[PDB]
Paper text:
The RNA chaperone [name] plays crucial roles in bacterial gene expression and is a major facilitator of small regulatory RNA (sRNA) action. [name] is a member of the Sm/LSm superfamily of RNA-binding proteins, which is found in almost every organism from all three domains of life. The conserved core of the [name] monomer consists of an α–β1–5 fold, and when these pack into a hexamer, three faces are presented for interaction with RNA. The ‘proximal face’ is close to the amino-terminal of [name]; the ‘distal face’ lies on the opposite side of the [name] hexamer, close to the carboxyl-terminal of [name]; and the ‘rim region’ or ‘lateral face’, which separates the proximal and distal faces, provides additional RNA-binding sites.
V22 and G34 are within the hydrophobic core of [name] monomer close to the distal face, and residues L26, V54, and V62 are at the monomer–monomer interface. We found that the [name] [name] mutant bound to the A17 RNA roughly 2.5–5 times more tightly than the WT protein. To further elaborate on the properties of [name] [name] mutant, we obtained diffracting co-crystals of the [name] mutant using two poly(A) RNAs, pA4 and A17. The crystals of [name]/pA4 diffract to roughly 3.0 Å, and the crystals of [name]/A17 diffract to 2.1 Å. For the [name]/pA4 crystal, two [name] hexamers occupy the asymmetric unit, leaving 38% solvent content, and the hexamers stack tightly through interactions of the distal face and circumferential rim, but leave gaps between the stacks on the proximal face. For the [name]/A17 crystal, a hexamer occupies the asymmetric unit with 49% solvent content, and the lattice interactions are like those observed for the [name]/pA4 crystal, including the gap between proximal face stacks. These are unusual lattice organizations, and the space in both lattices is likely filled densely with the N- and C-terminal tails of [name], but these are comparatively disordered and could not be modelled. One molecule of pA4 RNA could be traced at the distal face of one of the hexamers, and disordered portions of the RNA polymer could be fit at the distal surface elsewhere on the hexamer. An overlay of the WT and [name] [name] mutant crystal structures reveal similar conformations around the site of substitution, within the error of the intermediate resolution of the crystal structure of the mutant protein. Alanine substitution at conserved residue V22 or G34 have a modest adverse effect the structural integrity, and the 3D structure of the [name] [name] mutant in complex with RNA was found to be largely unchanged relative to the WT protein. In sum, the results reveal that an alanine substitution at residues V22 or G34 in the hydrophobic core of [name], close to the distal face, leads to the destabilization of both class I and class II sRNAs under in vivo conditions.
Numbering used by the authors:
A (entry chain A): 4 to 69
B (entry chain C), D (entry chain F), E (entry chain E): 5 to 69
C (entry chain B): 3 to 70
F (entry chain D): 4 to 67
The structure:
RNA sequence: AAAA
């Protein structure tokens, strides 16, 4: 079992870096990666919203993550 | 393992109003009645079946315990 | 993890013959009568019998309540 | 028991014109020459291969038996 | 059976130029150099990998037999 | 029969060639393919962005 | 790249 998806994400979760999730419709949902599974990433901010990964273009971190 | 069954099942028991933004930027604000592997059945004036393959984000209207 | 609300909902909109609206991810309204559905398409019947693709449907909204 | 292969296998068996609308709001009008699982070869002035994942609804030009 | 790989393998052996329309409505006009099950490598000025999950209709520039 | 998605990216990385990444939104993400997993390409420019393959339309390398 |  290997990948770059969980690693990159569980990182911006642990070191809690502010992230910007871009949607395939051109919407910028910016928050913090509380958790994620195989279909959704719960981006938390004022309210915790469940984001389906099938609408995510790119997730750009606000600061590099070790 | 799953974070969707808990999130949705939790917006059902608690009867917390939701918004369900669509991949077209369409806001569907109702209440989660139930859901399966491919849809959720939001309830408002008339219950609707929203395909998850057309759902961008589902922001609750209030945090939830 | 073991239930299919998709076959009910649409089947109940046929046995009761309740008019559905159909919404497309492009923002299109396809209003008609659920004649039959498989695992990928639902055949809406209005002036002609058209095979709509489920992969292009955002929401389907009955025009009045429905029974069970 | 699918209605996608029969419906198409009958809009080709009685050689009926169809519209093969696209999810981009595009209408591809022609005649169904063949299909498989991911494509239907609509042969109009040109023989093009339309990916079913880009098709919203396929509406016949007239009723088909 | 398949109606996809063949059409493409014949749009390669004959070396017909092709237009590949994207779900966005973009026209990538080049020549089909190769394909797997998820991408089709179209080479015009520089070989570009085009994902088939973003292709609507692939119309040839001339009949392919 | 044989994968062409990895060998293409594994060769656009080993040769450190700039690459264009058109998206299904008509977006153009220019950068360098640092790594690639089944669902994602880790294109980098100023910060390492994770682009989802299911949001990419075409990927035109800058040079052969 | 319309926190819509």
């Amino acid at each position: 079992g290997q990948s770059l998806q969980d690693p990159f994400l569980n990182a911006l979760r642990r070191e809690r870096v502010p992230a910007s999730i871009y949607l395939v419709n051109g919407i910028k949902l910016q928050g913090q990666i509380e958790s994620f599974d195989q279909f959704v990433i719960l981006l938390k901010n004022t309210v915790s919203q469940m984001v389906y990964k099938h609408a995510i273009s790119t997730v750009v971190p606000s600061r590099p993550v070790s």
